[PDB]
Enzyme design. Structure first.
Site: not given
Ligand SMILES: C[S@@+](CC[C@H](N)C(=O)[O-])C[C@H]1O[C@@H](n2cnc3c(N)ncnc32)[C@H](O)[C@@H]1O
Ligand SMILES: C[S@@+](CC[C@H](N)C(=O)[O-])C[C@H]1O[C@@H](n2cnc3c(N)ncnc32)[C@H](O)[C@@H]1O
Lengths: 282, 271
Positions: B29, B62, B87, B138-139, B157, B214
């Site tokens: 990304q 959040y 993060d 990758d989850g 998340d 947001y």
């Protein structure tokens, strides 16, 4: 003289610098300075959900989409906190949204609405007909004038509820306190807990020092406001009354199922504030 | 364009750029990190594929909501999985719980955590915790290779996937995911809610939060329970009983309860 169809409306201000929120303009319906403020009305992007938008002095005050949130919260959180609200005063609210919500209550025998800008209501009649319909109600008397002057000339113990639909010194809130009946409830639009928490604390204590027994800040989810959340101070003249719990649940009313935001569970939750802002309500 | 970060149909939200700290496409990304206007409160801002994901100002909302609403809904959360959260914000909140013996964090983009270490040191501090094991991967692949009944809580998340999430959870397991906005995509929330229920989870409830960055000023989270008869809308264990309660800037038990009260136009999501 500026806003053009196809252009973009840009909202921006101080207190909160280095930020801007913009909306595309499909059609400018009105854009000119009135006697008191700059009134802008335009149709937003049709592919978006906002519809007709009204802005005052560059700040969005009404949109077709989220309009019901702020009007239901101010109207019902205040009246449902009163034992029997029969006579109601609205300062501002020229668009007619809060009035519409107050008129849903069958207990309300009369409502006085005093907005300083008559052109706001004229343009609301034209471009927000579903909101301004309330202005022509038999139980409503609509006055074009200053609310400061109005409350000063209003006798003692006139109103059951006073709703201040306008973001006003100590003489004004002294007047609001005195014109309310013993079990009277005052309602005002509060600031954001994010971009001006400090002014909320000041306003809250200032209102209590004026003479009101209790004041509680209610939070709401309103998407069009800079930080996505404005609030409202629900003040109480009488001592020993908890406005955070609905005195009269709106579910017992027939219009309860017509509302799009407010109900008794939302009422309760609105007074739950983030830990950083909790001290306001204690 | 000129010192102004813009986000997104016929609308847009913009922030002034004081200094660009990072801006480049990673393997998965586009990662953008910049210092916002000093006279504004946002501070350091992170955006992924043009969408703001982290800011110094509201970051805690959040992360506290996802972390604490989920764990405080569990009887005794000892093993926790976090998919995404590079993060380190949700991880930090999970680690506050003394019951947590171990937490696995799996984020697909290793550059996100590298840049988080550099530009969000107070958030990413949790990534180096002894009780944390941080994986770059990758989850989807992780959960499919994870054995049955491994975790007490899974925090997403970010059908085979949610079948895996259900399976890898222990009998009283709680799943947590970031939900969509009730304003700009209410229809997707209902779909997601039903889909998760039909996957096998006993109950799912949507929690609302006040997050100013947001688009519409409010995102949400779906808290789902593997065990039937569990009401996640009331804290199973109030956070007030833990020693870290007063360190939280957003979350408490009253906010927990308040978060599941939805507007009438959105009430069908929680029934
Ligand atoms: C447009 S409403 C704003 C409410 C809006 N729904 C919001 O979200 O904040 C504000 C109104 O208060 C009126 N107003 C401003 N000053 C006033 C005053 N001193 N006395 C009476 N009305 C006033 C304006 O004419 C304006 O129409
Ligand atoms: C930055 S978090 C977004 C949460 C943020 N706090 C917010 O406000 O929404 C998104 C993370 O999920 C990660 N991610 C995306 N797809 C993933 C996948 N398939 N498996 C594991 N992590 C993934 C990304 O690398 C990114 O670091």
């Amino acid at each position: 003289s500026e806003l053009i169809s196809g252009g973009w409306f840009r909202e921006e201000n101080d207190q909160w610098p280095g930020q801007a929120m913009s909306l595309r303009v499909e059609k400018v319906l009105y854009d000119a300075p009135t006697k008191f403020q700059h009134l802008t009305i335009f149709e937003s992007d049709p592919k978006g959900p906002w519809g007709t938008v009204m802005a005052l002095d560059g700040c969005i005050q009404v949109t077709d989409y989220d309009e019901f949130v702020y009007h239901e919260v101010l109207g019902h959180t205040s009246l449902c906190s009163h034992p029997k609200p029969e006579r109601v005063l609205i300062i501002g609210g020229g668009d007619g949204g809060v009035l519409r919500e107050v008129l849903r209550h069958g207990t309300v025998e009369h409502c006085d609405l005093v907005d300083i800008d008559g052109e706001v209501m004229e343009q609301s009649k034209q471009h927000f007909p579903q909101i301004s319909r309330s202005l022509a109600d038999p139980r409503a008397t609509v006055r074009v004038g200053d609310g400061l002057a109005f409350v000063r000339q209003t006798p003692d113990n006139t109103y059951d509820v006073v709703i201040i639909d306008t973001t006003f010194g100590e003489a004004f809130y002294k007047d609001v306190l005195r014109i309310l009946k013993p079990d009277g409830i005052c309602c005002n639009q509060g600031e954001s807990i994010w971009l001006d928490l400090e002014l909320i604390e000041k306003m809250s204590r200032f209102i209590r020092e004026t003479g009101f027994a209790s004041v509680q800040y209610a939070l709401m989810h309103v998407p069009t406001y800079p930080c996505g959340s404005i609030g409202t101070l629900v003040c109480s003249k009488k001592a020993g009354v908890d406005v955070t719990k609905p005195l009269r649940p709106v579910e017992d009313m027939p219009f309860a199922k017509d509302l799009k935001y407010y109900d008794s569970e939302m009422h309760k939750a609105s007074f739950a504030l983030p830990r950083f802002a909790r001290h306001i309500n204690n």
